[model samples]
Every structure is written in structure tokens, then in C-alpha cells.
Target: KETAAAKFERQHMDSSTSAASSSNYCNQMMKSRNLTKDRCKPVNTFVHESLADVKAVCSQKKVTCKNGQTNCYQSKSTMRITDCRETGSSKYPNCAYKTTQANKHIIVACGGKPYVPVHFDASV
Candidate 1:
């Protein structure tokens, strides 16, 4: 079977398709569901709020090298992720969405409780 990491890498490299698909998927999901404090719980209480469903990931630290290299690193969080790219459709606006640059396992939490974050194909 093809690996998820490989699939993520491939999809991330395709900005056009991934962007469209991920954005659309997010919108559809949100429209059909309620993400309010009463309906959802948060994963991290310290980093989130009762009404803070959408927040940006902003943290960084150096990571160990894969093959004896030095100074390898990655961002610590995905908080800064926005909902979607802008167009003139103006039908559904104000939805903050973003696509992962790599294959990511979504950790869904709300109302200070844990919810499941399932993976959907990030490609359009």
C-alpha cells in the first residue's frame, strides 16, 4: 500500500488541487456541523478557549537530523493556519481554513474535551 507520508508529500506539492479541495472540504464539514463551545471541546485548554475553535499554530524548535545532518527543524504548531484562499464568490465568507503542507493527523478537541480529527483526502 502507498504510505500516508508519501501521499501527503505528493498532495502538498500540488498547491492547486490541494488548495481547492482542502478548502472546499473544510467549508462543507463546518457547514454541516456546529463548532461552538456547547457543541465542541478544545484539545489544549491553555492554548484554546471555549469559543476559540479556529486559532493559528505558531511555535518553532530545532529537530534532530534524519541522516547525521545538523540543524534540522520544523514548526511546533499549526495554529496560524487560515481557512481558505479568497475569491469573489462571497457566498460563504469568514470561514478560516487552511491545508497542511504535510500529511497531518488532526487532533480534534472542543469545549475543553477531546474530539476526533479524521483524515479526509486533501486533494481536489
Candidate 2:
């Protein structure tokens, strides 16, 4: 059996590939799951944002500010993997393990409101 993350990724592969697409998915999922920034879990928030948020965070960090736009909103955070640990019983051993804890996040804030957030995990 596939892990929930793997299964979700497979189901949302196309949606995961583009920033615009994934942003939409995240916004929708967050709403459905009753997630607010203060109440969001890292994994759920990350997945809700789909993988595009990962790329956006990285891009924001690497690029310099352009005029009035923010380069990146710097924050340190990491996603805790789903609790099912790897063993012979697991479909894939160590499949969701993290090698490092360094993470970066960008929240696009405008007029004191967050448009959306981008989170990046260096471990990936």
C-alpha cells in the first residue's frame, strides 16, 4: 500500500508541477481543511500548498527584490513526516524520512494580509 503522501502526490502530480496550479489547490484545500496559518501543521500546510510552494519559496530566497516587491519572507520551519515509520511492514522503508531540518518559508504579505505562503525544505 502506498503512503498517504505518495498517493496524494500521484493523484496531484500535474497540479503539483506549476506554481499557479498548486497555489489554487492549496487555497482550496486549506479552506476545506479549516486551516489557518496559526492552526496549520507543517505537513498539511506544505501539501495543501502542493509542491509549487516549495519552488516559490526557493525562488524568492535566491532572487533579489525587484522594485517594490518583496524578495522572500524569511522564516525557518520544517515538515514532520507522516508518523508511519519505515520497517518491513511498511510499503517503503524510510520513504518519508528527512535528512536535515533546515527549512525556508515565504509568506506573500500585502496590506497586512497574506496572499499565500511558500515553504521550502532543504532536506528534499
Candidate 2 residue-wise lDDT, 56-102, digit = tens: 44333332233345543432444322211122321221122111212
Q: How many residue pairs clash in each candidate?
A: 16, 0
Global CA lDDT computed for model 2: 0.32
Give, for candidate 2, the lowest lDDT window spanning 10 residues: 93-102
Q: Compared with the true structure, what per-residue lDDT tens digits does model 1 show for residues 41-87?
A: 11111111111222111112333344443333333343222233323
Q: Kindly report which residue stretches of model 1 are placed more than 4 angstroms away from their true locations once superposed.
A: 1-22, 36-93, 104-124
Q: Tell how far residue 75 is off in model 2, in angstroms.
A: 7.4
- In model 2, which residue pairs have backbone atoms overlapping below 3 Å? none
